[model samples]
Target: NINDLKLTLSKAGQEHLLRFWNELEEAQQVELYAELQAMNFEELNFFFQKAIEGFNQNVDARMEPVPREVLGSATRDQDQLQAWESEGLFQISQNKVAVLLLAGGQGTRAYPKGMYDVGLPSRKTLFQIQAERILKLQQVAEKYYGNKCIIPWYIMTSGRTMESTKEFFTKHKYFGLKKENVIFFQQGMLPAMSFDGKIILEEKNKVSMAPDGNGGLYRALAAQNIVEDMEQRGIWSIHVYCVDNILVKVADPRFIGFCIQKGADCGAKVVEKTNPTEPVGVVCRVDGVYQVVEYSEISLATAQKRSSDGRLLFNAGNIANHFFTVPFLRDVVNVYEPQLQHHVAQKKIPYVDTQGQLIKPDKPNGIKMEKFVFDIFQFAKKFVVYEVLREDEFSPLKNADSQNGKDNPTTARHALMSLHHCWVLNAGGHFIDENGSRLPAIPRVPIQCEISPLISYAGEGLESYVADKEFHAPLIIDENGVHELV
Candidate 1:
């Protein structure tokens, strides 16, 4: 039966199968042959080995529990905030700051076809909205700081979405940014294996692999030799973020000012967890090493612990936004490279067989190894965590559905509207109600808001809205206008 199965494969397949069989240990061959003989090879068992190897290699690096400390908050008074903003402008003008955007994802959860710049009724795709803020921030930096406040925008993209992402930017003329200043890089891909850990080729030219998690930023940067690019350009610091967070601060001067003044080599933006149970990694010192304790790795008992001040000990949760010094990043790739850990993920991968037909496996078929960008917090000489108002600063468009199963676009649109409504209300604007006692909620369906990366970056008419606007309804605000209400 095993021979018959081998015979069914083409010449290349036969060679691949024999080579794969020869690579396995004697015990593995016995187990694999028995399993393969019983199946139609709908999905091969080779990937399982890859998963095992990946798991075995990285298991020790998983989060280890440690004592917790009372994290401090860094919110500034109005005068201090204004001063920081002023200095941040100066930093940008000197070409000492860069912005790194992690945009390598395909928004399959939100829309089909996974296009990078999909426009929904509510707002632009996450990439489009984020790019708009980045462009606006650059405008402010140039105006207040100086000409040549060239904050090089580096976008990391994936194999699947890379082409489309580039095309989208080309179509938009770099979203009002200089095409030369906006550099796009691709992260290295690891091939997915069958659940048993055998390399499963997706097609002749490639093996399927996920964009190693954002943690792979270091490797990606080093592999592309982008650090040299940064050093040559005199970039001293960088602001990094995922593409999905529409409200992310592109290059917030307040954040940069804090990091610069504190002498922090690396810093992360965090929000106080809304509840003890929110699924998020909390920034904490593990055995005196700064690290993010993945929510999954935290035990129920540890997660439930409260601090002496009646707050959760693990309240400072990462928002996947960070700032790092360029020199510090260089050190990470050089001296500290081996000390960093690679995290593994189990995932079901689709593949193609000899006939070029697609195959989707029900079970996890391979391992994807990723280095988390935040994993290096432990390596920082000095690391700072800053607390931010989550609602105003951290609405992420990750899942397709809310906890209540509402469409994510609708929910994100609502969150944006709510932020705007709050802005309007605070600005001393009245929501005039046609019906007594019931000011109609801002419709979430047709949402519109002029969102800025930072409140201080608000230009002219935008400043008043940023200072005083408040929302009373579900709303989704786009560049054009409100798209919907609920």
Candidate 2:
């Protein structure tokens, strides 16, 4: 049987398999053979060649900044905001909108799976917090139009996080969302490879692999027949976002309305860079195509360049929030899937050596290739960029609280509390500081005030409940405690 596998591998251009055949245990040999049998040699060769070419390519030429227009917040006319809001509300009420959350990642950096407790004051998990926002938006739209509107939430998980993610949702009863409205699907993965194009073995019996990155969303949707499901459900527009953004407006009405108003086939939500060196991709037009260039690929001169008004030339910082029409997504899946390019990352991979012993390298050893979701922007016919305030919508949970991390649990909690504090003040309410003393003005004191979505969604529907109400420090205003505030 081992001989037969060796023959097959040789035919597939993996003749190196024979080198370690006798050293491996029988079970390990069988497992390795099966994995090799499942691979496509032609496809692997193409990817390997492309990776080598990209790896050897010059980096300096890729640093040029492309010109593009960004809709700045200062130029947002009041009349346009009202018009987009009205249009977005109408779209939501008609049940034409859906949400796709890119959450295929494990909580290795923060917690376990998607159950990380990010809400410091309320102690609500990330899933629960996002679920509440979706429900609140649904209710708001339905109440405005006097009709029921269903907003289906589609969560994309990965092989590593899928089981735990499902179990967490089941344990929490889908966070008050209708069980049927919440859909779970997994993204794809790609095998790790050595410098010579050989598949790396994580163990004697298994090949090492990793998630194929967020750009695999298109492939995952097609594989799961999610596109067909959306078509049947009459969802015309989809709001897609990362799961780590604690303040993400799920099914955001204003964004949807803006895309519709501009007749945009695809759109990205962006915030102006606080400084030139902010570690985020800058959205710009490269060769007349919409794309994002990473901070590493941009030069210092281009990054810090200023316009006549003293604004950064490349100021539109991407926030990983996007909108896409159903037809545009369908075309992307059907026609442009092959055109998506893969980016390579050097990673340390443990593997079985020629002596049949496992060795773990401390430094970079192999390559992990990935495709980014924003790369598809180059294919959009009508693309737009909507600018929002960073403090209002862009606090991300990327790192652990330890080691003086910036985007950690502590910062996420502070961002939420600060936002709610502002909302209470805007509603004509006074806040007591953490010491139980009344605050003289807005945001002068740091108070932990957590407002439930059920109490007020997006700071609206709160004037009545909070008007003249003096909220104590570390206050939680939820359905059970609404009367306390009143």
Error of 1 at 79 (Å): 5.9
Candidate 2 stretches greater than 4 Å from native: 1-8, 15-38, 57-75, 109-113, 401-404, 433-437, 441-445, 483-486
CA shift of 62, model 1, Å: 12
Q: Tens digit of lDDT per residue, candidate 2, span 1-486?
A: 666666766766666645666667878777777767656666766877787676673333443343445352414645577678768878888988889999876566533435778656678987888889888877887888888888899999887888888888899999889889898998988788888788776765667877888888988999999988899889999999988878888878888888898899999888888588887788887666788886766778778988787988888888899999999999998999889878888878898776668899898777888778888888998888888888888988875532256778778888898898888888888776446577865553467788888777678777887898887777777877653322
Tell me, what's the RMSD of every candidate?
8.4, 3.1
Over the full model, what C-alpha lDDT does candidate 2 score relative to the true structure?
A: 0.79
Q: For this target, which candidate reaches the highest lDDT against the unseen true structure?
A: 2
Alpha-carbon shift of residue 229 in model 1 (angstroms): 1.6
Local accuracy of candidate 1 as per-residue lDDT tens digits, 163-230: 87788778878766788888888875555555444556554334455666677677778878888998
| Candidate whose TM-score is highest | 2
What are the lDDT scores of the predictions, listed in order? Answer: 0.64, 0.79
TM-score of 2: 0.91
